Design a protein around this ligand. Structure first.
Ligand SMILES: CC(=O)N[C@@H]1[C@@H](O)[C@H](O[C@@H]2O[C@H](CO)[C@@H](O)[C@H](O)[C@H]2NC(C)=O)[C@@H](CO)O[C@H]1O
Length: 342
């Protein structure tokens, strides 16, 4: 029963690792170590060494059984560019593999995660396969030589097994992934946002082709063992500015990104509601939204999270993950999620 949370190092001054309620998790990720092109000596951002070192001892104080992983990469054009350069170069792949394993041990992490959005087109999937295969072997080798349990290995995946469902450029090799990785983190969010001029449920469980369930279905149909899938749930919402203040439902016309640049933390959504926004639960999509004047935000709330976590349990998944834990300062949704699975 995997209860996973991502902590982004950017949030340190407002949400240090000590603020994480680690009682509500089995695994916590430090996001992110950098690829460090062109040498690919993987490292935490220079100047954050102390934060990275203290992360695991700090979170374990509240729940000593909690384990940690360090995630490499993250969303971003530069990260994608760097994985693409890395994966085509056998020597660079060797440097990456050696340095990433050494990094996890250096800072006391129990595993590694690759956050690569995304290994497409086909050539990029093929070269990512080379990187991951070599990493899996090196992880097993380090376990033998050190005598310690092998590092865990996970990766972020698109919500769907096919990249992309509308135009198939490539797809995740599920048998390969099941063999080399402990699990994958299914990014079942950002289905809708301010890039569309109409409001929608950004992480709809069901509805449309862009839903968490359809994505999960696609991985299972391909032959992914259910226990290898960990369902992502966002701790942020996607916001729009409304074209008309009297049109406030799902599918309402919009004119651009709401605060803050199209994304709002769950905690800020709670502030929004306490400041007069109306919360609506949408049963059709299994989601929530809130609005006030010209601002509209779609997100997951207490009810939709419980429904998603039960869904994951029903689908026999390995568990769930939250992106990202700093966005729910009072850990409202991680509490509901943990209680639901138990
Ligand atoms: C289901 C799907 O393919 N959704 C796409 C969105 O992912 C994407 O939005 C972007 O998602 C990133 C991570 O998923 C975010 O980091 C990023 O902020 C977000 N971009 C914006 C402008 O909000 C959109 C836009 O490219 O396309 C969807 O198809």
């Amino acid at each position: 029963a995997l209860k996973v949370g991502f902590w982004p190092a950017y949030s340190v001054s407002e949400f240090p690792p000590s603020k994480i309620n680690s009682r509500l998790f089995t695994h916590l990720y430090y996001a992110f170590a950098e690829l460090n092109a062109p040498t690919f000596e993987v490292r935490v951002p220079p100047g954050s060494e102390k934060t990275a070192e203290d992360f695991t001892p700090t979170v374990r104080r509240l729940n000593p059984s909690v384990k940690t992983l360090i995630s490499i990469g993250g969303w971003g054009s530069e990260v994608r560019d760097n994985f693409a350069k890395l994966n085509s170069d056998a020597s660079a792949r060797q440097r990456f593999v050696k340095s990433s394993i050494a990094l996890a041990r250096r800072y006391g992490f129990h595993g590694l995660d690759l956050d690569y959005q995304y290994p497409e087109p086909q050539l990029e999937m093929e070269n990512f396969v080379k990187l991951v295969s070599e990493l899996t072997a090196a992880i097993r080798e380090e376990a033998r030589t050190s005598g310690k349990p092998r590092l865990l290995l996970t990766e972020a995946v698109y919500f769907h097994q096919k990249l992309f469902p509308w135009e198939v450029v490539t797809e995740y090799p599920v048998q390969f992934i099941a063999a080399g990785l402990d699990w994958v983190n299914v990014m079942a969010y950002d289905f809708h946002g301010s890039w569309e001029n109409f409001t929608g449920a950004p992480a709809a469980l069901r509805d449309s082709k862009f839903t968490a369930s359809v994505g999960i279905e696609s991985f299972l149909a391909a032959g992914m063992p259910p226990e290898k899938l960990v369902l992502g749930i966002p701790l942020f919402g996607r916001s729009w500015l409304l074209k008309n203040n009297n049109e406030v439902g799902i599918g309402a016309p919009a004119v651009g990104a709401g605060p803050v640049d199209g994304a709002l933390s769950f905690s800020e959504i709670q502030n929004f509601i306490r400041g007069g926004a109306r919360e609506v639960f949408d049963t059709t999509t299994v989601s929530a939204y809130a609005y006030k004047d010209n601002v509209w935000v779609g997100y997951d709330n207490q009810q939709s999270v419980a429904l998603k976590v039960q869904y994951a349990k029903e689908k026999r998944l390995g568990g769930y993950f939250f992106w990202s834990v700093n966005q729910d300062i009072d850990a409202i949704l991680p509490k509901i999620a943990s209680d639901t699975w138990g």
